[PDB]
Write an enzyme that holds these catalytic residues in place. Structure first.
Site, PDB file in Angstrom:
ATOM      1  N   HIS H  57       0.836  -1.192   0.000  1.00 17.15           N
ATOM      2  CA  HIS H  57       0.000   0.000   0.000  1.00 17.15           C
ATOM      3  C   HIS H  57       0.877   1.249   0.000  1.00 17.15           C
ATOM      4  O   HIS H  57       1.070   1.871  -1.046  1.00 17.15           O
ATOM      5  CB  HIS H  57      -1.047   0.032   1.134  1.00 17.15           C
ATOM      6  CG  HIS H  57      -1.896   1.268   1.101  1.00 17.15           C
ATOM      7  ND1 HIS H  57      -2.201   2.004   2.238  1.00 17.15           N
ATOM      8  CD2 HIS H  57      -2.477   1.928   0.070  1.00 17.15           C
ATOM      9  CE1 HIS H  57      -2.958   3.037   1.910  1.00 17.15           C
ATOM     10  NE2 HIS H  57      -3.132   3.019   0.581  1.00 17.15           N
ATOM     11  N   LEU H  58       1.404   1.604   1.178  1.00 16.51           N
ATOM     12  CA  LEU H  58       2.207   2.812   1.292  1.00 16.51           C
ATOM     13  C   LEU H  58       3.631   2.478   1.720  1.00 16.51           C
ATOM     14  O   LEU H  58       4.586   2.979   1.129  1.00 16.51           O
ATOM     15  CB  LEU H  58       1.516   3.837   2.200  1.00 16.51           C
ATOM     16  CG  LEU H  58       0.243   4.466   1.625  1.00 16.51           C
ATOM     17  CD1 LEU H  58      -0.277   5.567   2.535  1.00 16.51           C
ATOM     18  CD2 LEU H  58       0.453   5.006   0.214  1.00 16.51           C
ATOM     19  N   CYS H  76      -1.443   0.275   9.508  1.00 10.84           N
ATOM     20  CA  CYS H  76      -1.462   1.653   9.053  1.00 10.84           C
ATOM     21  C   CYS H  76      -2.808   1.992   8.431  1.00 10.84           C
ATOM     22  O   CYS H  76      -3.405   3.012   8.771  1.00 10.84           O
ATOM     23  CB  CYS H  76      -0.327   1.928   8.073  1.00 10.84           C
ATOM     24  SG  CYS H  76       1.271   2.076   8.913  1.00 10.84           S
ATOM     25  N   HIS H  77      -3.256   1.141   7.504  1.00 12.67           N
ATOM     26  CA  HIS H  77      -4.517   1.369   6.815  1.00 12.67           C
ATOM     27  C   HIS H  77      -5.350   0.091   6.817  1.00 12.67           C
ATOM     28  O   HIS H  77      -6.413   0.046   6.198  1.00 12.67           O
ATOM     29  CB  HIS H  77      -4.302   1.986   5.421  1.00 12.67           C
ATOM     30  CG  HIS H  77      -3.342   3.128   5.431  1.00 12.67           C
ATOM     31  ND1 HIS H  77      -1.976   2.937   5.391  1.00 12.67           N
ATOM     32  CD2 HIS H  77      -3.533   4.460   5.532  1.00 12.67           C
ATOM     33  CE1 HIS H  77      -1.362   4.100   5.450  1.00 12.67           C
ATOM     34  NE2 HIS H  77      -2.299   5.054   5.532  1.00 12.67           N
ATOM     35  N   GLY H  78      -4.862  -0.929   7.539  1.00  9.37           N
ATOM     36  CA  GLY H  78      -5.588  -2.174   7.730  1.00  9.37           C
ATOM     37  C   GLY H  78      -5.701  -2.980   6.440  1.00  9.37           C
ATOM     38  O   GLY H  78      -6.800  -3.176   5.925  1.00  9.37           O
TER      39      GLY H  78
END
Ligand SMILES: CCCCCCCCCCCCCCCCCC(=O)OC[C@H](COP(=O)([O-])OCC(O)COP(=O)([O-])OC[C@@H](COC(=O)CCCCCCCCCCCCCCCCC)OC(=O)CCCCCCCCCCCCCCCCC)OC(=O)CCCCCCCCCCCCCCCCC
Ligand SMILES: CCCCCCCCCCCCCCCCCC(=O)OC[C@H](COP(=O)([O-])OCC[N+](C)(C)C)OC(=O)CCCCCCCCCCCCCCCCC
Ligand SMILES: CCCCCCCCCCCCCCCCCC(=O)OC[C@H](COP(=O)([O-])OCC[N+](C)(C)C)OC(=O)CCCCCCCCCCCCCCCCC
Ligand SMILES: CCCCCCCCCCCCCCCCCCCC(=O)O[C@H](COC(=O)CCCCCCCCCCCCCC)COP(=O)(O)OCCN
Ligand SMILES: CCCCCCCCCCCCCCCCCCCC(=O)O[C@H](COC(=O)CCCCCCCCCCCCCC)COP(=O)(O)OCCN
Ligand code: HEC
Ligand code: HEM
Ligand code: HEM
Ligand code: HEM
Ligand SMILES: CCCCCCCCCCCCO[C@@H]1O[C@H](CO)[C@@H](O[C@H]2O[C@H](CO)[C@@H](O)[C@H](O)[C@H]2O)[C@H](O)[C@H]1O
Ligand SMILES: CCCCCCCCCCCCO[C@@H]1O[C@H](CO)[C@@H](O[C@H]2O[C@H](CO)[C@@H](O)[C@H](O)[C@H]2O)[C@H](O)[C@H]1O
Ligand code: FES
Lengths: 383, 124, 61, 85, 71, 54, 244, 111, 110
Positions: H57-58, H76-78
């Protein structure tokens, strides 16, 4: 015969800075040339000074910049001066290119100074990109990572070229030391090209805001433009002062005060503000290689202005339609800049693409069409 | 672009009744907004002259026309640097905006374009 | 508009006291002030800037 | 295309008489008040449209885009955001 | 005692009353929704962060200057 | 006032000497004047204002 | 992005140092050092600050030497090449609470408390962000926020879940100047101190800027007079044309 | 167990997968996978999941053993990764990258 | 005379360039050579000692001296190149001399 004319060395100086015949009607937008020379001199002086205190090794680089800020006498000033002048250098260079586009400085007989100028612009970008990396903060590292990965797009050899640039398998010490060496060098190369574009220009002389010949009415470069250049020098220094002394970090990214950490990726990786329009153009194209080509083409397309401008008249002072088109082009370039720093989210994705299409269509479609039509309007209109 | 091209295209427009009906009024307003007359220029003063063709055409101007052109350019340069506009007799009136140079440049270009054509002739 | 010996009107700009020493002196006072601030500014710039090369705080410790 | 002093490459000039006065004999700021007010207003008025039109259009465009973007990332904009991706 | 506590409470009851009530109503909805079963196996779980931010942003606008004046 | 011109301005050597001497005076007095001004607008804030406690 | 993901943006508080002509309040700086020393220094280093930096800012030479001399630092090895310790000197840097990252993370449920020497420059908002963050822990997270274990809710921190718990409570510090040590007071002082730590030249920089602004303004005014003076022959030029 | 080896600074998750873990991974129909790949494509040795331990993701590092597909969960964003280290749920677009690794011996791998 | 005189300056810049480059190795000769050569400036009356400390950036040759010599050693060859170009431009007015010392205007070669 006067010494300044007799002696070959003095005579070269004389021909550029003293007896040089200039049009007598240059307006203040002809002052960006000298401001850019002032920026270049400030950058050389501050840059060479920082180099006396900076250490290029990745283990020490960030700390050496802190040492400059904290320990070196007036280090804070020299560091901020160098960093802020890099921003002013781009403001002045865009202004100078803007002046040249508006007043048709790129038309014959000045295609050569224009074309060398396009290379100066590329060298400035490379210089400023490498200089940014030297801090080795988070933005330094992540910016280098993302920008150097664009070379991976080059087919077949791309990956190999990136490893070659890095001197390694990621951005790290070898990259930092090489960028230091090149960042030191590139401003001297840039100074040579700046000098070449002046020498090229000296055959035609400066254009002027009316776009007519000035051969009929010339003025010595000194004292008239010497003292006129002082006004913008002091106006520039006032703007420089307000940034360097009172808001030294307004143009900066806070993330660059965090040491480079290859693990943690920053929230948003954006380039320095002056590269943002090119970054927006890159994002607009979905293809990796396409994006890179478009980004380079956005600069190299300036080289076709001499061809695509079909006007029989030099510059825009007397061309209402061209002036409107130019206004939209400039504002679009600023919108691209803004879209370069937003997140890749709706609705900015589509907007970025439309602005990119407008950017290219100015050179390829609108300027050729509008310049053709205005030719006809001037002829029919004055019959 | 060449003056020849501009002049030929303009003549195609002036021929077509429809086209002239819509283009002539536009071009007249364009010229009013262009504002070169406010600096005491005639249209032809503004044509780019740093080409071999245009240098030749300027050399072919009658001395009187040539001297007057130099005056208009000097006068306009002075208005430009002063940030003033022409007033009174210095403003170019529509009747004074004569195409003094167009005949000369059309002749220069005619020969230059014939030269290009004939350099490419093939005996049949 | 025809005679070249009839000098155009310069009365809007001509100073009445143009040949007085007071008149020249005033313009040189402006030039001199500008030279004075440029000298003071250059001295300040040079002195502060070159001081970077004197021993830094960590060395003096 | 440009020469140098004495052979600049001007067409021959004849019959223009040029007059000026010494910098010491002139008032450097003569009519400054009139120029600063009336002349600047004239020059600004004549150029206003060429600045206002593009600036106002692109500012409106940006305003619309930034407001939509902000709204899409609220609770209220969840559905419209889901479609937009 | 901490001057902020009083100033924040005053600004919530006064100039930021609309936002206070929005946050309150939000909380009520979400807590009730968490109370209901098969909430854990829902797609979308509503939070109150947006309303909280509107309230806090408002309180800060009406307080910042007052608070630093008494320190 | 002719006298003033003749002494300080007419010879450039004298004019440049005058400018540099004036720059010297300006530099020293401006330094002192700003120091005092800065201390008045930042009264009770600076180390010199609290140092006396220690 | 969602507002949550950005973090709530901190209010603009009127810091004494905001203002073109304003220095730091050094009394606040001194108080803020005492907050750093008694609260933050348990977890956060200040590695870019040396004892000498406090001298003539917050403390006299003697007070700072006293602080240095209380600690032990690594000396050069003795004559048998065995390691030795020495008492601190003013040139020494303020030592950190943890020997390395791993030790720091182990003590903070995996989170690494950043060095605070630059933190005021390294976050959008600066002093205001530090003040807002330290004071901005709500009693209860907004209903519906799911905190990861060992996280605390703080709206000013991006994402909302911060590994640092609330640490300032009324009277955790006893200020030596008799100022009431309220949460807000301590946060203001420490935020001022950290701002100073990030930009210690601040006071000198603004004074030199004042001098520069004045000189450059005067030179700009004079350059305009001189330009107009020298250009008047060209601006004033008049023509008479008699066609030949 | 899942190890973390630094390799080019970036962390490498090495999991010694059990028999039943391998089985659990070999279940999911490739069809329903943002990034469609089977374990066989990912690992060259079924008992050695070697991945570049950075979320696609990131770029957080997922907490292993956590998740909803019990492999890796980026906090972080699951985003949830599998025992193959395939993305199942959350914002992450791709499966956790596999480095270029060889078993020189059966008891040592080079990366 | 002018190309000759500019040449004498090129020669001085070459000496400075090469001296600084030698220091950069920071071997024993690097350090001790820098020490003794920079101590010559101590001879300048009144200000000599102060100038040496200024060159060194310190009280002895050490890190500050090394870092500044790196920066200047990088720079000096570009300054040297400019002067080399100037002496050629100066020469171009007279043309090269020749081994007979007579004019060559009578017999030139591209
Ligand atoms: C950066 C570093 C700092 C240094 C400062 C350098 C900036 C100087 C410069 O080039 O711009 C000043 C420049 C003054 O130049 P100038 O020599 O008086 O006239 C140049 C133009 O011909 C002036 O064009 P004009 O004669 O048609 O007058 C136009 C101008 C009025 O110009 C002024 O005198 C102001 O007014 C405007 O266009 C304003 C737009 C309307 C907004 C409402 O101001 C502008 O032209 C601003 C308009 C730009 C759009
Ligand atoms: C923002 C939008 C700017 C559009 C400008 C339109 C013209 C105008 O009104 O400007 C005033 C003036 C008008 O001057 P002018 O020379 O056309 O007219 C003078 C007055 N008359 C006509 C009577 C002789 O324009 C300039 O001076 C333009 C310079 C352009 C600089 C652009 C910088 C942008 C950077 C982007 C780089 C890629
Ligand atoms: C950058 C540093 C700036 C240094 C300027 C300091 C003094 C020089 C000065 O003001 O020049 C005035 C002088 C005199 O200005 P002037 O040449 O206009 O005055 C000559 C006429 N008299 C002598 C009768 C007054 O300029 C120079 O001598 C040129 C040097 C400037 C560089
Ligand atoms: C920064 C500081 C700027 C320059 C300060 C110098 C002081 C100038 C005052 C002295 C002065 O007016 O005398 C002239 C000197 O100017 C000069 O000879 C120089 C004139 C202006 C200098 C600046 C030229 C352009 C500035 C832009 C920078 C260029 C880019 C490169 C970085 C003489 O000259 P006169 O003919 O008026 O004398 C007429 C009589 N003898
Ligand atoms: C190289 C970077 C160029 C940018 C210069 C702008 C300001 C930097 C000066 C440093 C500074 O802070 O000086 C202040 C005054 O500024 C000033 O008064 C300086 C502004 C003057 C503008 C430029 C005039 C010439 C400068 C360039 C010439 C250098 C070479 C020529 C010999 C106060 O500092 P201070 O007063 O305490 O300083 C001790 C002497 N009392
Ligand atoms: C006992 C632990 C502890 C104490 C006491 C502590 N902190 Fe922290 N702090 C942390 C940890 C852990 C983080 C990292 C939080 C994270 O990244 O999730 C942190 C983060 C921060 C951050 C940066 C947050 C960001 O944006 O990355 C600031 C600023 C900060 N602390 C300041 C302070 C100040 C000021 C004090 C006390 C006056 C303080 N801290 C007391 C543990 C502590
Ligand atoms: C370091 C960067 C540069 C410096 C220092 C510089 C300097 C100058 C100077 C002093 C002039 C003459 C005066 C003036 O018109 O302002 C000039 C003219 C010119 N420059 Fe630049 N320049 C630089 C970069 C560029 C770039 C990037 C371009 C083009 C993309 C460019 C194109 C031109 C052109 C076309 C002219 C002739 C314009 C005219 O007078 O009509 N220059 N430059
Ligand atoms: C066109 C000229 C130049 C430009 C546009 C330029 C640009 C930059 C930029 C943008 C940075 C990042 C600054 C920061 O945020 O800290 C930088 C850093 C640096 N530059 Fe330059 N630079 C130029 C010339 C030079 C020169 C000639 C040197 C001579 C060595 C130099 C040395 C440095 C050094 C050492 C740094 C790192 C220290 C620091 O970040 O301040 N630069 N440069
Ligand atoms: C980087 C160092 C130098 C370079 C690259 C350089 C290059 C040249 C070149 C190419 C020429 C013309 C061809 C030739 O006669 O060999 C020349 C001529 C000359 N150089 Fe040098 N030179 C350098 C250093 C010096 C030095 C140190 C001096 C004097 C001390 C000097 C004095 C001259 C003179 C007087 C001439 C004219 C000689 C003649 O043709 O009769 N140059 N140089
Ligand atoms: C800008 C910084 C100042 C330093 C000068 C810039 C360095 C570049 C100079 C070398 C390039 C050659 O520069 C070139 O030299 C000669 C004489 O000097 C000039 O020649 C011009 O002036 C001389 C007299 O002044 C005339 O004999 C000649 O007819 C005219 O064209 C050229 O127009 C210029 O192009
Ligand atoms: C041919 C040129 C001649 C050689 C040039 C000389 C180079 C170095 C000379 C002086 C540099 C150090 O000299 C010193 O300057 C600094 C300013 O920089 C002054 O320092 C003063 O102002 C600065 C800020 O302006 C403060 O940080 C300082 O506390 C204060 O004392 C000193 O009072 C002076 O003693
Ligand atoms: S960073 Fe891994 S889930 Fe977003």
């Amino acid at each position: 015969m006067a010494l300044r004319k007799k002696n070959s060395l003095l005579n070269m100086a004389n021909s550029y800075v003293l007896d040089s015949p200039q049009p007598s009607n240059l307006n203040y937008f002809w002052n960006f040339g000298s401001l850019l020379a002032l920026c270049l001199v400030i950058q050389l002086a501050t840059g060479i000074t920082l180099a006396m205190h900076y250490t290029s090794h990745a283990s020490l680089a960030f700390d050496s910049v802190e040492h400059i800020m904290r320990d070196v006498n007036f280090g804070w000033f020299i560091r901020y001066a160098h960093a802020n002048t890099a921003s002013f250098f781009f403001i002045c260079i865009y202004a100078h290119m803007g002046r040249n586009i508006y007043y048709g400085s790129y038309k014959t007989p000045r295609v050569l100074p224009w074309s060398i100028g396009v290379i100066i612009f590329l060298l400035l970008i490379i210089t400023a990109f490498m200089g940014y990396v030297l801090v080795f903060g988070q933005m330094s590292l992540w910016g280098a990572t993302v920008i150097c990965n664009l070379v991976s797009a080059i087919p077949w050899l791309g990956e190999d070229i990136v490893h070659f640039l890095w001197g390694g398998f990621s951005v790290g010490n070898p990259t930092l030391q090489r960028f230091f060496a090149l960042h030191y060098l590139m401003p001297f190369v840039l100074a040579v090209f700046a000098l070449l574009h002046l020498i090229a220009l000296h055959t035609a002389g400066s254009s002027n805001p009316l776009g007519i010949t000035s051969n009929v009415d010339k003025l010595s470069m000194h004292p008239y433009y010497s003292f006129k250049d002082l006004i913008t020098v002091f106006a520039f220094l006032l703007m420089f002062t307000l940034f360097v002394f009172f808001s030294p970090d307004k143009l900066g990214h806070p993330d660059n005060y965090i040491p480079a950490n290859p693990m943690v990726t920053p929230a948003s990786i954006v380039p320095e503000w002056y590269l943002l329009p090119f970054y927006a153009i890159l994002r607009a194209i979905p293809d990796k290689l396409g994006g890179v080509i478009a980004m380079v083409a956005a600069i190299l397309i300036l080289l076709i202005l001499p061809i695509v401008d079909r006007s029989i008249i030099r510059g825009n002072a007397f061309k209402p339609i061209s002036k409107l088109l130019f206004g939209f082009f400039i504002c679009n370039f600023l919108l691209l800049g803004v879209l370069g720093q937003v997140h890749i989210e709706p609705p900015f994705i589509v907007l970025g693409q439309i602005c990119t299409i407008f950017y290219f269509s100015y050179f390829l479609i609108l300027l050729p069409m509008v310049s053709t039509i205005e030719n006809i309007f001037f002829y029919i209109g004055s019959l | 672009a060449s003056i020849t091209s501009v002049v030929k295209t303009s003549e195609l427009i002036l021929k077509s009744p429809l086209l002239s009906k819509i283009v002539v009024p536009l071009a007249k307003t364009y010229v009013k907004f262009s504002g070169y007359r406010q600096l005491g220029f005639k249209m032809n003063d503004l044509i780019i002259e740093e080409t071999p063709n245009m240098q030749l055409a300027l050399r072919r101007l009658p001395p009187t026309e040539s001297y007057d052109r130099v005056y208009r350019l000097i006068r306009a340069t002075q208005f430009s640097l002063s940030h003033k506009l022409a007033t009174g007799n210095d403003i170019t009136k529509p009747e004074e905006d004569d195409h003094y140079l167009i005949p000369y440049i059309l002749d220069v270009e005619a020969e230059a374009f014939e030269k290009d054509a004939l350099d490419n002739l093939e005996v049949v | 508009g025809k005679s070249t010996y009839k000098i155009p009107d310069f009365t809007p700009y001509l100073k009445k006291d143009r040949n007085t020493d007071a008149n020249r002196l005033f313009s040189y006072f402006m030039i001199g002030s500008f030279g004075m601030l440029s000298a003071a500014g250059a001295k300040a710039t040079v002195q502060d800037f070159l001081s970077n090369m004197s021993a830094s705080a960590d060395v003096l410790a | 295309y440009m020469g140098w002093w004495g052979h600049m490459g001007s067409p021959p000039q004849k019959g223009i008489a040029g007059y000026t006065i010494s910098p010491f004999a002139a008032r450097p700021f003569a009519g400054v008040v009139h120029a600063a007010i009336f002349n600047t207003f004239r020059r600004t008025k004549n150029q206003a449209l060429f600045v206002i039109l593009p600036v106002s259009f692109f500012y409106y465009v940006w305003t619309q885009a930034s407001e939509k973007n902000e709204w899409l990332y609220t609770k209220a904009g969840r559905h419209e955001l889901a479609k937009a991706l | 005692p901490d001057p902020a506590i009083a100033l924040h409470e005053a600004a919530a009851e006064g100039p930021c009353h609309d936002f206070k009530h929005h946050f309150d109503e939000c909380v009520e909805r979400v807590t009730k929704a968490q109370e209901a079963e098969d909430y854990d196996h829902a797609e979308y779980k509503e939070d109150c962060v947006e309303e909280f931010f509107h309230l806090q942003h408002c309180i800060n606008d009406n307080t910042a200057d007052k608070l630093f004046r008494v320190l | 006032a002719t006298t003033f011109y003749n002494v300080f301005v007419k010879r450039n050597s004298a004019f440049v000497a005058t400018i540099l001497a004036s720059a010297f005076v300006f530099d020293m007095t401006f330094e002192t004047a700003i120091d005092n001004f800065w201390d008045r607008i930042n009264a009770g804030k600076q180390w010199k204002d609290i140092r006396h406690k220690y | 992005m969602t507002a949550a993901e950005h973090g709530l943006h901190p209010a603009e508080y009127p810091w004494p140092q905001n203002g073109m002509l304003s220095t730091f309040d050094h009394a606040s700086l001194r108080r803020g050092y005492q907050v750093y020393k008694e609260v933050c220094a348990a977890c956060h280093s200040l590695d870019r600050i040396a004892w000498r930096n406090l001298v003539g800012v917050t403390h006299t030479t003697d007070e700072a030497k006293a602080f240095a001399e209380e600690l032990e630092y690594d000396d050069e090895p003795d004559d048998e090449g065995n390691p030795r310790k020495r008492p601190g000197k003013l040139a020494d840097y303020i030592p950190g609470p943890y020997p390395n990252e791993q030790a720091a993370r182990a003590a903070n449920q995996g989170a690494l408390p950043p060095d605070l020497s630059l933190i005021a420059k390294a976050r959008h908002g600066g002093a205001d962000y530090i003040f807002a963050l330290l004071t901005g822990y709500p009693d209860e997270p907004p209903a519906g926020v799911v905190l990861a274990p060992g996280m605390n809710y703080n709206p000013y921190f991006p994402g909302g879940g911060i590994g640092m718990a609330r640490t300032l409570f009324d009277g955790v510090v006893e200020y030596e100047d008799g100022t009431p040590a309220t949460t807000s007071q301590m946060a203001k002082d420490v935020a001022a101190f950290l701002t100073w730590a990030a930009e210690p030249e601040h006071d000198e920089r603004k004074k030199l800027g004042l001098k520069a602004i004045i000189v450059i303004s005067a030179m700009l005014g004079l350059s305009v007079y001189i330009k107009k003076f020298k250009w008047s022959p060209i601006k004033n030029r008049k023509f008479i044309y008699n066609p030949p | 167990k899942n190890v973390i080896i630094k390799w080019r600074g970036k962390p490498i998750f090495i999991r010694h997968r059990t028999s039943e873990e391998i089985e659990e991974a070999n279940e999911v129909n490739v069809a329903t996978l943002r990034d469609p790949q089977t374990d066989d494509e990912r690992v060259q040795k079924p008992e050695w999941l070697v991945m570049i331990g950075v979320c696609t993701h990131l770029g957080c590092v997922p907490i292993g053993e956590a998740g909803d597909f019990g492999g890796w969960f980026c906090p972080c964003h699951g985003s949830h990764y599998d025992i193959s280290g395939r993305i199942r749920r959350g914002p992450a677009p791709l499966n956790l990258e596999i480095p270029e690794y060889d078993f020189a011996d059966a008891e040592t791998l080079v990366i």
